[PDB]
Amino acid sequence: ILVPMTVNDQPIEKNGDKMPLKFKLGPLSYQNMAFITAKDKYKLYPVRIPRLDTSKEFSAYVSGLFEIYRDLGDDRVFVNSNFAKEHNATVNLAMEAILNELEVFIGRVKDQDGRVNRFYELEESLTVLNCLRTMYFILDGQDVEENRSEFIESLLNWINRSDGEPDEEYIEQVFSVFETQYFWKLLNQLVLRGLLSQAIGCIERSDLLPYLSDTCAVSFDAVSDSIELLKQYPKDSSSTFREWKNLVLKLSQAFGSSATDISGELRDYIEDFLLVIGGNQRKILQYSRTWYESFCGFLLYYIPSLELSAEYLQMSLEANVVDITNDWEQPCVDIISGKIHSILPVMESLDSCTAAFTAMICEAKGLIELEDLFSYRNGMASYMLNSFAFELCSLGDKELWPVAIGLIALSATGTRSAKKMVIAELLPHYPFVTNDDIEWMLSICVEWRLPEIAKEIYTTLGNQMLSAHNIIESI
Amino acid sequence: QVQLVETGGGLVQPGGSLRLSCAASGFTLDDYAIGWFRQAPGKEREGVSCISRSGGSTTYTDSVKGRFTISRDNAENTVYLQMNSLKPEDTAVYYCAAARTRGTCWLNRIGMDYWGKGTQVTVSS
Amino acid sequence: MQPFDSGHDDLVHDVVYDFYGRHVATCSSDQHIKVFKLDKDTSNWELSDSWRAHDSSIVAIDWASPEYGRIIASASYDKTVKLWEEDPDQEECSGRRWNKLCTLNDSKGSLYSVKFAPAHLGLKLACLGNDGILRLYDALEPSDLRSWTLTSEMKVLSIPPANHLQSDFCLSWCPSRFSPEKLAVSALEQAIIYQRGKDGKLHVAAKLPGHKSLIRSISWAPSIGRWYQLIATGCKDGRIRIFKITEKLSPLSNLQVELLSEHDDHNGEVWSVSWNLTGTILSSAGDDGKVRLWKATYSNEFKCMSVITA
Known part of the structure; x- marks a missing residue:
């Protein structure tokens, strides 16, 4: 990815006489700095971290996704022929819930927007999620005859919204x-x-x-x-x-x-x-x-059962190859043909939050296939989750720090002390700005047995950073 | 008594275009071997193009790929061969070939003995 | 987020963010020190106070932890290190907002780098200069911001050659809170790590071999939630070098030094190396006029995720 730091004042024009360019990542995501140690180069350049979302709709989307994640509680990994549906049925309900959440996000983006490329990436992620729910989040491994009404209703949806050729x-x-x-x-x-x-x-x-x-x-x-x-x-x-x-x-x-x-x-x-x-x-x-038109037809009008899918896709792929113009086609093609490992990277190229929670609910469904926290577990879902958490920690949005701290506290990987170390190192950087917010920091310090950080934070609060105002009111 | 009439041949200059057309009887479902063949003077008859599936795919020969274009009218006993970028290597008598019905059956009595009567396609240097 | 003139007539050397990222410190060769504030309401960096107090070119600068107040250290070629506390009872842009707390003049040569120690060790700082002697100072009483005693002196380089303008030094503390006290030193072609022993003294614990030229900048990236340490060095040969550290077989040289990554994507001297606050992203910049960002893969390999500008 190649981005200009400033599409206005480029400090280097000629190739000769290369200048020492220096850059520093700031404690806040969207405020990093660059400069040049050279004669007549006295401009400071604020370069926001590339491909990021600072909008309030994104924060509400993450808040909703973390609510559904906490709502899903304790589900990790469980073919088999025993007991009941358990997480399976519940997982699907959760899947259609996050799909609804992503749709509300896309709607609020289309309303208030300045750049539409983000809208394009989100819609590609929604298309892949529609394919995923149609393929593994309705029939529960069974066939079409078990629940035809739901399956088709999703398939006709996934095709309709996917492309734009009918226009x-x-x-x-x-x-x-x-x-x-x-x-x-x-x-x-x-x-x-x-x-x-x-x-x-x-x-x-x-x-x-x-x-x-x-x-x-x-x-x-x-x-x-x-x-x-x-x-x-x-x-x-x-x-x-x-x-x-x-x-x-x-x-x-x-x-x-x-x-x-x-x-x-x-x-x-x-x-x-x-x-x-x-x-x-x-x-x-x-x-x-295209090939999905073919696949949609074979499911629709020859045989409506899930089995011949492997055949259908192949025949469709023998008529119209995967269009590399977009980033959802090969994912869906892979999604239909068993392999799911490849699609997680591509979705992470679209949106890290959507990709992280997608890998989470996929592990929840099972669908699978040295002791750091930032290390791979069963299906690298902890990676997707803990990295999205670490990414959120730098965003400087105090409305999402509860999401990150909760997401780390809910990781199946890492000791109680491993998460304790993570919170102890991360919590001081929390953007506390209101007098009622510090109750949250102190409560977490008590919850994870870190009273030393609690008193060290109240020292910084002490004298409002050493009498750094006059009135220094509550707000 | 069914027939296989074909038209569109003629004499053109190198780099010119021609359009071959052909018609037939039965043309019943799939399992086709229906397509254009050609015979150069003195040489043996080689396959030019053929509709294997019903729009699913095409089988071209390696000397016309990217230049010739075969098309078929849906579920019908007609074919069109668009010959673009004609060269002196395409000079031959072109034949329409097909199959009357479409069942696996047995490997005997291929269609009718009369195939396409032939149309002469010659491209000068 | 548009560019803006700093206000310096001479070369700007270092720019450092405060603990919260809403303020920025700057120092230049026209002896000047500047401090800018980013308003909460709009994204427009604006000058707070910048009327220096120095005599030679200033090179380094750093912020202290806010649990000690608003504190800024400055090192210049005048063989001194000056400490400043912001006086909030002064108008901004008056030359009156920052007061000199103390002036350390123990260095007999021009200084190049100074960085505050982590907050969990008291008001502690390190400085290095042409004398080749690293100096640790401490404010023993956090109530007296002028009682700055000299904690330690270490002769890193025994023979500092005078008739050479090709000199460079930087320092980087280990930001890890739950790790033994240690600090990296960037002197010349060498890069060595000092660790606090049981005797309260420093000792050479490890080195970073492979550097074949001058080291322009180093940065101990504080991995948050990992058992190893990562340190990246920008070298003059044109190779960002990311080293991994993990002591093994300790009954009671133990420190380990892996070379995780070498990257020559800049094709020229790497001048700047900075880490994220979470140790997730590593930034580098060089002669190509481009800045590259790096993240760790699953196999602990670092991969370039973005390149910016000309």
Whole structure:
């Protein structure tokens, strides 16, 4: 990552005569200093720590995530066939809770913002979290028939929000210049996305219904029966689905062996549509612009069970390779295909808080695969957590220091004395500024048996830092 | 009695373009071997392009990859071969090849004996 | 967070943050000392007081722990170390805000570095200069900020060559609170660590081999929550060198010296090396006009996470 310290006054212009540049990290995150020990270079440069979040919405998001973490209490790691759901069911409830929390964060960011790149990173993290919850946070390792209503509702969500290919700019390109092939590509792209209402609506928009009445009726009836069929699509039960796909296959067979009173290309645009709905693997893969459109189709219309996922993704990856433009595609691709180790780094490139708590709830679900605190444990979740805690300690936001101290006190790694050492070394740097806040410091000193730091902090409070004011009121 | 008619051939200059078209009967589901082959004068017939899956993928030969483009109309017995950046190495008689129905069956009676009648594609130097 | 002129006519040597990071101290060769305050309401560094009291070029400066009050030490080429306590009963920018507490003149050569000891050892400071003799001073009574007695003197270098303008020294205490008293010394091509013995005296405990040129700056990074110690040295050969320290096999030379990292990404002299408050981030700067940040990996390797500016 290459960032300019100042996009205004660059102190070095030429390559020759290199100047001794000096830099010092400040006790506060967003206030570090740089300078130059050279003639005619007497400017001080405040360079805030790169890629950071100082907004109040971020602090409320971290407060909410730490509440859910403390709310989740004692869960670490537990296939198996014994006892009950325990953490499993509870873990999912917690997963959809943090997903709601991340969405509220993204909403408050889109409202008050100056840079939108943070909004882009958060939405990429939300897309990966949607994929993760769809893949391992609904069925609890089982199949789709167990709980079809929830699974699809999440899948149709994860696809819909993920990309932005279905948009007003794209449709108008094809809506402005039925006969054209592109129309059917977009219709099948809508179908592969479960965007039923959009597809049906475009129908009215589409040239065909009156014209079908004008031409072969039968086909027109048929197309109307297929429009009706998509309105009556069942999401609640797999048994209802079984009849549904049976009906679509009977309709596709009946039309394939029927009268051809239309154009060859129109006959050749209706059979596809019927067979994409039927779930034939070729043309789900044909009219797919990306791989997740393919994967969404195979889950939707061929077989709705989780098992053939390994196959589906492979076939989809044989149609449209992983788009490296964004940072969520390969993660989701890896997430679907078992491997989860690779995605934790990429999400840490997006947001450290989201990535840390993601690794936390993943360990909580299990999903796995010399005695420092900053050292790897089972799944390096303590790393993600304790490092995010250490990162927060420098942020200078006193509303988040309780989060950091709590997150360290809740680490499964490290002795009681290891956390005692950490608190003893970290607590003096706490930005106490109000007279009622020091009760928190003294209570923690009592809680972790550090009375020496308690009295050493009251000495600094002594005389308000040696009579550093006049009135020196409570506020 | 089904047929395989093809058109679009002709005589063009090096670096020019041509568009080959072909039609057929049955074209029933997948398991296809349907595609363009070519035969140079005196040489043996080599495969140019072929639609393996129904839009899932394509099989090109290594002398036309990046220049030729094959497309098929969905679930239909037609093919188009767009020949861009034609060179004197593409001078041949091109043939449309296919399969009447699509079942694993047994390896006997490949379609019908009449394939494509041929269209002459020659690119000068 | 836009640049601003310091107000110095000559070269600025060192800039040090206070304990809370809301104030900044500065010293320059025009003999000047400056102190700036960052207002809580807006991010705009503003001058508090800067009318020096020195005669030669000032090189080093540091803040004392706030449990001792507002205290600033200053070392200059005038072979002296001056101590200053802020008088809050004076208007800012008046030349009246800071009063000289004491002046240590025991050094017979020009001084280069001074750093306050950690808060858990009393008002204690170290200074080093051309005399090649490190001096530890202490304020035995925290009530009398002028009773600054000399605690210790150590001859680090026996032969300081006079006819050489190629000299450099810095000092860095170990910020760890639960570790034996110790301090690193940056003199010339050598880098040695002094540790407090049972006899109340200092002793050469370890060295940092591998430095093949002048050491421009060192910084004992206070790892918070670790059993080892980390110290980074900016060397003139163009290699940031991060060393790991961990004593082993102690029945009662014990100190260990690992060389965790060597980095030559600057391609030139490394002038500045600073650590985070949590020992999580290491900063370095050199001749390329760029500042690089480093974090530790899972295998205790340091990896460059960001490079800034030209």
